[PDB]
Write an enzyme that holds these catalytic residues in place. Structure first.
Site, mmCIF file in Angstrom:
data_model
loop_
_atom_site.group_PDB
_atom_site.id
_atom_site.type_symbol
_atom_site.label_atom_id
_atom_site.label_comp_id
_atom_site.label_asym_id
_atom_site.label_seq_id
_atom_site.Cartn_x
_atom_site.Cartn_y
_atom_site.Cartn_z
ATOM 1 N N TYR A 192 36.230 28.618 48.980
ATOM 2 C CA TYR A 192 37.448 29.333 48.604
ATOM 3 C C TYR A 192 37.169 30.823 48.755
ATOM 4 O O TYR A 192 36.092 31.214 49.217
ATOM 5 C CB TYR A 192 37.896 28.998 47.183
ATOM 6 C CG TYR A 192 38.213 27.534 47.000
ATOM 7 C CD1 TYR A 192 39.125 26.902 47.819
ATOM 8 C CD2 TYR A 192 37.574 26.770 46.030
ATOM 9 C CE1 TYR A 192 39.417 25.568 47.671
ATOM 10 C CE2 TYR A 192 37.861 25.428 45.879
ATOM 11 C CZ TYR A 192 38.788 24.833 46.703
ATOM 12 O OH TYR A 192 39.095 23.490 46.587
ATOM 13 N N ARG A 239 30.338 30.630 39.504
ATOM 14 C CA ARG A 239 29.822 29.401 40.084
ATOM 15 C C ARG A 239 29.457 29.578 41.555
ATOM 16 O O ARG A 239 30.157 30.236 42.306
ATOM 17 C CB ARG A 239 30.825 28.253 39.940
ATOM 18 C CG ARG A 239 30.263 26.900 40.447
ATOM 19 C CD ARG A 239 31.164 25.693 40.121
ATOM 20 N NE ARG A 239 30.367 24.471 40.025
ATOM 21 C CZ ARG A 239 30.820 23.268 39.680
ATOM 22 N NH1 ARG A 239 32.097 23.079 39.409
ATOM 23 N NH2 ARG A 239 29.979 22.246 39.606
#
Ligand SMILES: Cc1cc2nc3c(=O)[nH]c(=O)nc-3n(C[C@H](O)[C@H](O)[C@H](O)COP(=O)(O)O)c2cc1C
Ligand SMILES: Cc1cc2nc3c(=O)[nH]c(=O)nc-3n(C[C@H](O)[C@H](O)[C@H](O)COP(=O)(O)O)c2cc1C
Lengths: 404, 404
Positions: A192, A239
């Site tokens: 992403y 993350r």
């Protein structure tokens, strides 16, 4: 098939660990897990309320919410995922963070920005483009699909980038704090937006946000520093999936190796910690796993061990930890250092009381990959009932309503 | 005290391995080991002849010579180390590479450039400065010492750099080929010149050779590419000590972590290999060791495991491999992949027939750290005689003469 397991009650997994300003009582964590049971307008629902309440019954557990949008431009999914840019959003999430808190547990929210893999049909309905670090497509299909609706992916301008930091993400960090979140986690994995920006296969920018290892990381770090000064470092998580090839990230086959890309980044984060600005945890993704799907023993080509030699703070690992079940040899090694947490996603989906089950070695109910991404209560909150009262219809008819 | 050891004859350590265009018959290697028994004018001697001949008696062993100077500007030592810039040099080294070859063995030469740690008293006698990537000193003493003789360290100009590649090192690669060397190894470790250039604590250059990870590596890679096209990739080696703090390299405490610095570099080297330009081997230095001295179990803070996940070719490891003797658990793990070699330095100094001793588990004679760096045959070639004929005087009087 169900999974037979041995008790973790006496392990380091039930030793207390300080993560930011909160102390967890278990090291077992529910990582961010997308389920598309939010309302049409991206607001949290009566289903998510039960679903998150359900999993917080072990006092001092840390829950991490499904990817949540930071803004209309950050969305891009056909399914109903939640947002946290409006007050409508926040007040709803609030009902949920209260529920988890009343159970002595904690809850962090993962802030996601789709970018180059937004569905161009949906962005079109918001009068938006698909965006990214550069103008690239996941696949050859994803590029044609986009053009067919006349909505190609466009590269952000040096200005639109700054606005992500100081308008887009800032607003959401604040609506998050308003919402009751104990942390917020920058989703910098799974190809992403932030991952797109970090790595060369998706970032050939010519400005200050591209062109070098340093530049490519520039944006992530600007969000860290700035958001540190809005919520405080002790409430920031990030993350990373150094090795994943989800949504076509080249990973070990890129022009810059993930070890190179992520040691730099992690070591910059450590330097901040040294000046008293350390974020709460780095969430990494074990090479056994890539996105929402397993990776085979033959294709694993690295580990996240480098993260532990560089970052001195809390680490959260996840990814198929019951592979060496029922003994959990690997999980017990990974938590030996006493600053590491362990994530269970999929088995959390069908085991609302997972923390309890692992504590006492109770057999893990298998998960229904079929109902991961569907739009009703069937395969969602059913696992909390006694199976023999589940009405498969009544529950498939049950879609997300609103709260209270 | 002597070291009792078990036989390696049946291990992978006596399985043949192709390194460039040559096949070694043992994976046990003598790494570059400075001894200061060269002549005054930096030319190889009758002592080095016996000393290298002595250690090549196992057919197909790979020997790596002591650091050798590429030019007057590259020197800087008070002791008599060898060079390979003149024809005088080459023709002498030739007598030695012949000797090793007549024994079916092979010999690579380590090309060293002292840089910022050259002794300013000696450079002065060549009408030279101490040089480096930037103008820095190992210690606070090494900077005052330099000024006292009015010879501070100066930073190379963008031009002097290019000349290293195309005049300095090129000449030596060629005198090396003239000399009979089967390889040449770029000494990019121990905080000498190339290491100085690679890492931020010693390289704050503003040109293209500094300022980024990419820039800092720029010079090393220019030597690789250019020297590849002069001797051929199959004859190029490089050494790295990612974790050493020899001559005050910050290592894990620098502004860029060694994992970041050396994955980038190693992965660039792999990309060249992919285009058919792979160098022969990467020589790394195990974290147990730093320069010419051990590192304690508590200060080891990394491993070279990342090198194996990035580079697909031959790796040479060294550094106190008899620590888990007599079983060699660790060495056997490190060579399991069948593309890794193992270096024994110090125990090679006092065991001229080391390869044989390891093969048959014969007890290792201890080494005399006192005579590592002295200027005579005592503690040098004595170990090849029967101890009871050694005349400690006659041999201390014996200094390096010339060959034939
Ligand atoms: C249905 C599903 C949805 C997921 N959603 C997310 C997500 O929104 N964000 C994220 O970082 N990871 C997501 N993941 C990946 C998991 O968080 C985790 O990396 C992976 O499941 C490995 O752990 P597990 O095998 O124990 O679930 C998802 C995985 C699944 C199966
Ligand atoms: C006296 C001495 C001289 C050395 N000279 C060199 C050298 O010129 N170049 C180099 O790369 N390493 C040099 N080293 C380091 C060794 O090559 C090796 O890294 C170290 O000895 C670990 O292996 P060992 O413990 O088996 O000797 C030297 C070590 C010693 C003790």
């Amino acid at each position: 098939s169900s999974v037979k397991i041995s008790p973790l009650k006496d392990s380091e997994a039930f030793q207390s660990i300080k993560v930011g300003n909160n102390t967890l009582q278990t090291k077992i964590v529910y990582p961010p897990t997308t389920r598309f049971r939010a309302l049409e307008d991206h607001t949290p629902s009566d289903l998510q309320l039960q679903y998150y309440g359900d999993r917080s019954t072990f006092p001092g557990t840390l829950l991490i919410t499904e990817a949540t949008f930071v803004s209309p431009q950050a969305s891009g999914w056909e399914g109903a995922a939640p947002g946290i840019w409006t007050d409508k959003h926040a007040k709803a999430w609030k009902v949920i963070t209260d529920k988890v808190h009343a159970n002595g547990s904690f809850v962090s929210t993962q802030l996601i920005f789709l970018g180059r893999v937004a569905d161009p049909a949906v962005m079109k309905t918001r009068g938006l483009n698909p965006v990214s670090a550069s103008a690239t497509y996941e696949s050859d299909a994803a590029k044609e699909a986009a053009e067919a609706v006349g909505n190609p992916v466009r590269a952000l301008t040096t200005q639109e980038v700054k606005d992500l930091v100081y308008e887009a993400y800032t607003n959401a960090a604040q609506k998050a704090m308003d919402a009751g979140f104990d942390y917020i986690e920058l989703h910098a994995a799974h190809g992403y937006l932030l991952d797109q920006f970090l790595q060369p296969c998706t970032n050939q920018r010519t400005d200050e946000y591209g062109g070098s290892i340093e530049n490519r990381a520039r944006l992530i770090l600007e969000l860290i520093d700035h958001l540190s000064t809005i919520v405080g470092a002790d409430k920031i998580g990030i993350r990373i999936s150094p090795w994943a090839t989800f949504q076509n990230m080249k990973a070990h086959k890129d022009t810059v190796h993930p070890l190179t890309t992520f040691s730099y980044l992690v070591h910059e984060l450590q330097q901040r910690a040294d000046k008293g600005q350390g974020i709460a945890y780095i969430s990494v993704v074990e090479p056994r796993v890539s996105g929402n799907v397993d990776v085979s023993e033959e294709d694993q080509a690295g580990d996240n061990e480098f993260v532990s030699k560089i970052w001195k703070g809390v680490i959260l690992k996840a990814g198929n930890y019951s592979y060496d079940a029922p003994e959990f040899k690997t999980l017990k090694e990974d938590i030996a250092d006493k600053r590491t947490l362990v994530g269970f996603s999929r088995y959390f989906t069908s085991n609302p009381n997972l923390v309890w089950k692992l504590r006492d070695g109770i057999d893990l109910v298998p998960y229904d990959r079929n109902t991961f991404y569907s739009d009703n209560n069937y395969g969602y909150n059913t696992f909390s009932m006694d199976s023999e009262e589940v009405d498969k219809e009544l529950e498939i008819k049950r879609v997300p309503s609103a709260i209270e």
